[model samples]
Target chain A: MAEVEETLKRLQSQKGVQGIIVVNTEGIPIKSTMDNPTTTQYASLMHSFILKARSTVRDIDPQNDLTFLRIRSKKNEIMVAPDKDYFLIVIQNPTE
Target chain B: MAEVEETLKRLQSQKGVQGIIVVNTEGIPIKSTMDNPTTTQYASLMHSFILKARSTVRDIDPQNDLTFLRIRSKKNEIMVAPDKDYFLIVIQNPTE
Candidate 1:
């Protein structure tokens, strides 16, 4: 888990990033480092959230499509970077 | 639209990026620079595809949202960068 924690801490050091979360596809948090409750709050929904977004994409491309996702909100911005096994989530203020 | 054209040309030169498109929220194509036929096909639904994703997030967070979206499919990946008036879309293959 050193690799995962190290990666999270690296991004968490960024100014806009208040938190970094690593989770599996089933909504399980493998690791979380954050300042607000919103991190975990959003974590639970991100997996299923992204999976369903793919379904929406299917309404357009019936074949392949699922990679990066960013959510802009009044509270914070959620940037999702997914891999084969994990979803790397960054919670921060939206920047130009 | 030189600025937009330049940006599209820059990204189009990338190895994985087979196409780049700039479109308004209503699904109107303002510019298109692509190789495969998928860009136009995907551009048509990117706006609403993302909007509905926001509504799904609303089922989770009832506050402000809508930022970036990436779709990973078997054939390729779609990255969406949303601004107030337009959406910058990049269609590429999935990468590590």
Candidate 2:
């Protein structure tokens, strides 16, 4: 969709955003603003994280589900927003 | 340590904090404010997440490492703070 593309582009333009990737439920990167290796690496790792988190929540309450995840590290931060069919991941630096 | 126990107690007393658990590197629950089943569930799931995220960061930059992770869901939010030897996990609700 054009609107989805527009939104991703705008998010990519934000300060501190190093890259953004839209991935399928199968952990395949459908759209990405990062280099091949970087995007592929994040897609696989974060997809597993998302699946684990989602099941964990459901185990606690069968009606519950995971919405988002944020990972902070020494060098950067990763934000993952999930939908039923896809996940949008953004990597960024710490902003003042 | 007594101070560490005190700290975890204080954190558990906070509003919206459902539970707190301190887990070792091997995913063993060292201390927890919740019941056995709940603590065990979170410890196992989050331990894998922490390890995966740490490796992912190191893969990107060998010198970097994961510091924290936050998983937000419809029911509550799970916060994980990782140290070299242990991980402190907190489950809480969204506050206004």
Candidate 3:
């Protein structure tokens, strides 16, 4: 648990990274840097997105597994990926 | 160009695929099966997503080229990828 939190902090400090969260395959939060008020909501949303991405890719490529998802909004971007059993979500401001 | 179109047709016929588009790196649509009037809008949306995904990954790993972007909505999903100087976009329905 400490190791996970430490890694989340390190990822948050990365350039462009605004937040980080870890979630189970079932979309349940394990750990996160999201504000306490919104962590659950954000984790659930990201978890669904990750599963959708995986299924979409698997349907097309058949043999390949989903590695990650990245979305760019006008003000920020979000990335989601699996790190073993837990999914990692990273949000950031877009680079100029 | 004919080969590209054929490939696109094959991709579209695959289960879950709703449409497919091939676009230049500049986001200009070369060809698309985006129904009648919204091809350009869909193409542009997909192009921007692909570029953002590429930039996001390049910022993080600094070692990979942007490969693809897939999004799942409640009713459908979209995928975008680069194929040479052109990007391929595929839209599909969610499987049960």
Candidate 4:
């Protein structure tokens, strides 16, 4: 959709954001701003990560649901905004 | 044991930290600063998340291993410092 493109572009332009990817509920990448291999790697990993994070929260408290997850590591930060139908993932180097 | 206790104490004193748990390789909570139920819940979830994150990273690049993981959500932040023998987990509200 036009709104999705607009939002992705907006996020990609933000400070420290290296790239962004939009993946469907099945963890298949539909759009990305990064190279093929890079996007593929992050897309799959982020999808699984989001699923686990979502599951973990619900298991702890059924009333709570996961909305966003930010995984910070030494080299990069992966931010995931999860939805029922899509997941918006972004990789960033906050130190940069 | 003394050094571990000292390090845990130091981390506990940090700003925003709500609780801390030390878990063994089996995902069993060995020590904690939170209630039993809360500690038990986080220890298991964090252990699994760390394992998945570790496996994901290695599958992408065999030479690299997971050093630390910080999962941030709307209500709280869970940080995991992974090691071969144990994991140090902490929950915090960075906004607080």
Best by TM-score: 1
Clashing pairs in 3: none
Candidate 2 vs candidate 3: the TM-score winner is 2
CA error at residue A15 for candidate 1, angstroms: 3.5
Report clash pairs, candidate 2. Answer: none
Give a tens-digit lDDT track for model 2, residues A1-96. Answer: 344555467557767778888888777988877876777877877777677767766766778767767788877777777766777787888763
Scoring each candidate complex against the real one, what DockQ results?
Answer: 0.45, 0.57, 0.07, 0.34
What DockQ class does candidate 4 belong to? acceptable
- Residue B77, model 2: lDDT of 78
Best by DockQ: 2
Q: Please give the interface root mean square deviation for model 3, in Å.
A: 9.7
lDDT for each residue of candidate 1 in B12-92, tens digit (9 for 90 to 100):
666677777777766776776665555577576776776676666567656656655555556666656655667777777
Instruction: Count clashing residue pairs per candidate.
Output: 18, 0, 0, 0
Model 3 lDDT tens row, B3-29: 566657776777888777778867788
Residue-level lDDT tens digits of model 2 in B25-58: 7789888878788889888888876676677678
State every prediction's TM-score relative to the real structure.
0.67, 0.63, 0.50, 0.66
C-alpha lDDT (0 to 100) for residue B28 of candidate 1: 77
Q: Answer with 2 or 4, whichever has the higher lDDT.
A: 2
Candidate 1 — which residues are off by over 4 angstroms? Answer: A6-10, A56-68, A74-76, A81-86, B1-18, B57-59, B71-76, B93-96
TM-score of chain A, cand. 4: 0.83
Residue A83 C-alpha lDDT in model 4: 57
**Candidate 3 CAPRI-style tier:** incorrect
Cα misplacement distance, residue A88 of candidate 2 (Å): 2.4
The TM-scores of chain A alone, one per candidate, are: 0.73, 0.79, 0.77, 0.83
- Which should have the higher DockQ, number 2 or number 4? 2
Best model number under lDDT:
2
